[PDB]
């Protein structure tokens, strides 16, 4: 006759969620510079990131309902303002601006303006007459010479992230406390849904740069064997679809203009870092990508789509549809500055079944509302000189078209813009559970009288 | 053996009763955005002292093993000794127990320590 018997510390866990915590290691912590991007209070990473494998455990993984993303989504926004609050508020910068088409010899059909405006000084009585050079996307005109005003003036209070704090993405390892853990799904071909064959537990993730970017993923994790195709539901065109490379892709992003930073005193303790006149040749931002590995990438990809869609079909690439500039173009911070690039010729293709490189135009925008939250904007101070950043492309986000013509051709374009998809890139293999160390199972045992 | 944290999971219970002091040891492990690392370990000592409280108020008061004067009712997951420990794992078994745990637990708290620890003062009052 069986009884009940209690066992403490049994390998029984249940699925739950709680608050996690960052690990930036120690090396990007030394970047300092008065709170470079994230790392300030961040906990160090484990020197030996112990990864323990569990056997005979069939665990069902979902990256799309994974809660660790929404946390990472909010922290980056809060940490963003945590920089801007001690930083310089640019709310007084909303002013009538007398600007001119920038100095060049014709051959246009500008976008840079020599902007003279009446400003204020640290001494509250006396005022300031200054000039600065602004990109066309941060201002708008108002209706003698044309007058201009900032774009955020009628929307949200503008601040400026002080030049000490940087935007540079720093690898972050999210960790879990006791009574909980993190599970890493290591199986090579894994679509992110359903059960996960390879289940291993860790207390912290790998290095994850919270890259603030759109249309392209940089510096992240690479896939294995075939390039993996992951989507929550592929029958819905609206749901975004994420990909992971087995081969990293090189890109060289540059701002070729040699900038000057004019620091003007709005204080005491306040001040504004303006843009000075370009020194020498007038060029424009751009990034280069190899066309050869690119063409082969689309060939290795199109062979992987023909497992899920058709054995032999047609695949066409076309440029984007419409939306905010943060979607329709590629956003990211290159070292101090936020670039917005035209992506067209990458996606000029039509594929069916069976030496040089490329180049893309780019634009820089300083005032940024990113994550769209109104009432508070931010201004990115200009960085002195030629900016260069090299990135490695580990991931993608795409959407599909619509019924069109029956079993004819499917078209694909860029997509996303919700940064929750950015964090799904490194979190696809992760999820959280909770331990139930108490258990009751029968046996012939019985306690005393 | 040292299978680490949760390493004896998909094995059956009769062999998986060896990482009990492994998982029992790794249960406790001992201005904004400094708050992110402070709230998390609060539930560790609460989850620990809940287990210690239930282990105390059940008739066991000691770690990792216990026995009971509570019968294994035939309304509770009727399996043989191989079919409990040797055929079913901890998740597989506790899955089956997930209905009737409280009907066990009231007998654990109430028929034991409200009874047999009441008997300790009655048998020791001489």
């Amino acid at each position: 006759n069986l009884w009940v018997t209690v066992y403490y510390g049994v390998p029984v866990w249940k699925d739950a969620e709680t608050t996690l915590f960052c690990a930036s290691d120690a090396k990007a912590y030394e970047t300092e510079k008065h709170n470079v991007w994230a790392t300030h209070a961040c906990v160090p990473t484990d020197p030996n990131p112990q990864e323990i494998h569990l056997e005979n455990v069939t665990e069902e993984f979902n990256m799309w309902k994974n809660n660790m993303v929404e946390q990472m989504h909010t922290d980056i926004i809060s940490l963003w303002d945590q920089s801007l609050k001690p930083c310089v508020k640019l709310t007084p910068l909303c002013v009538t601006l007398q600007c001119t088409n920038v100095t060049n010899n014709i051959t246009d059909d500008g976008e840079l303006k020599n902007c003279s405006f009446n400003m204020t000084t640290e001494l509250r009585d006396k005022k300031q007459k200054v000039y600065s050079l602004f990109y066309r996307l941060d201002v708008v005109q108002i209706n003698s010479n044309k007058e201009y005003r900032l774009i955020n003036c009628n929307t949200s209070a503008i601040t400026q992230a002080c030049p000490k704090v940087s935007f540079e993405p720093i690898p972050i390892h999210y960790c879990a406390p006791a009574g909980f853990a993190i599970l890493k799904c290591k199986d090579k071909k894994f679509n992110g849904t359903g059960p996960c064959p390879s289940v291993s537990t860790v207390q912290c993730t790998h290095g994850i740069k919270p890259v603030v970017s759109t249309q392209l993923l940089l510096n992240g994790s690479l896939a294995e064997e075939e390039v993996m195709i992951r989507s929550e539901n592929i029958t819905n065109n609206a749901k975004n679809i994420l990909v992971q490379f087995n081969t990293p892709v090189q890109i060289n992003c540059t701002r070729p203009n040699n900038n000057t930073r004019k620091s003007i005193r709005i204080g005491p303790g306040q001040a504004f870092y303006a843009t000075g006149d370009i020194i020498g040749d007038i060029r424009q931002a751009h990034c280069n990508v190899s066309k050869a590995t690119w063409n082969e990438t689309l060939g290795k990809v199109v062979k992987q789509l023909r497992k899920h869609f058709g054995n032999n079909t047609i695949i066409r690439f076309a440029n984007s549809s419409g939306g905010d500039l943060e979607v329709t173009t590629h956003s990211f911070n290159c070292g101090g500055e936020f670039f917005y690039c035209n992506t067209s010729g990458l996606f000029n293709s039509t594929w069916i079944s069976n030496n040089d490189s490329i180049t893309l135009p780019c634009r820089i925008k300083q005032i940024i509302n990113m994550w769209q939250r109104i009432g508070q904007a931010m201004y990115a101070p200009p960085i002195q000189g030629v900016i260069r950043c090299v990135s490695n492309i580990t991931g993608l986000i795409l959407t599909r078209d619509g019924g069109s013509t029956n079993s004819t051709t499917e078209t694909f374009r860029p997509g996303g813009g919700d940064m929750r998809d950015n964090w799904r890139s490194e979190l696809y293999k992760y999820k959280v559970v909770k331990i139930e160390p108490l258990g009751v199972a029968p046996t012939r045992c019985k306690r005393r009288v | 053996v040292f299978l680490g944290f949760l390493g004896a999971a998909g094995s059956t219970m009769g062999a998986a009763s060896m990482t009990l002091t492994v998982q029992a040891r790794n249960l406790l492990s001992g201005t904004v955005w400094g708050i992110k690392q402070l709230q998390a370990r609060v539930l560790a000592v609460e989850r620990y002292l809940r287990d210690q409280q239930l282990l105390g108020i059940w008739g066991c008061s000691g770690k990792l093993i216990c026995c009971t004067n509570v019968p294994w009712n035939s309304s509770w997951s009727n399996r043989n000794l191989s079919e409990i420990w040797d055929n079913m794992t901890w998740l597989q078994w506790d899955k089956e127990i997930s209905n009737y745990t409280q009907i066990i637990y009231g007998l654990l708290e109430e028929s034991q320590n409200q009874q047999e620890k009441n008997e300790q003062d009655l048998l020791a009052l001489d």
Partner: antibody
Amino acid sequence: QIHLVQSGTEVKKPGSSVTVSCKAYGVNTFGLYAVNWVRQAPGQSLEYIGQIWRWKSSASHHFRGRVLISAVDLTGSSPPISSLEIKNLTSDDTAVYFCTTTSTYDRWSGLHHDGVMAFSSWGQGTLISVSA
Amino acid sequence: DIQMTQSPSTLSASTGDTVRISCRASQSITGNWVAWYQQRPGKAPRLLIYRGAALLGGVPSRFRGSAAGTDFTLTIGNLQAEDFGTFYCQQYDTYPGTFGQGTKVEVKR
């Protein structure tokens, strides 16, 4: 919402075979849902035939080797669907044939018990009439 | 295979009544792996109760199940017009899942 649409009625002779389709609209995937085929004889009870869970096909011992149950995940065009094929028909197989969709995501759901499960979503049904 | 013997085969009731359908099993099912279904003629069955007394999302509170040893009982207090039909009990403790003979629920006259 989940809607299971199966094929149209079929009349067939003994010794022949037949496959019935089961459109599973609303199901995200057969990796988080299992498909059970159940037969209802005329004016009698229901009978379990087989299922497909974790992409593992199954037979009743009564129907062992006589039946085949296949399913495929959604085409880009269409949602994932299961198919029930029956061979060596007899007049004793004349019945209505049901498609079943049951969520398999939660181990504790109580809908399922190590492959043996209840049936949460059903289809209209396919009438198979066997006569010479 | 488990054999489910349902009882009664037919019962009569009227709106608002409290009605009871019993279903006994050949073996004892401790895990309470028994379900309840309603089938109006022609239309497909609807899952009403699983695991003994678990209510499926959207099933009225008027339906409630009780499981004790071998015997099972589905209870319908406040019987409605929409409720009339035939009912079946299903076990899934052992493979294969098996159903009951069925209980017709007719109106009174």
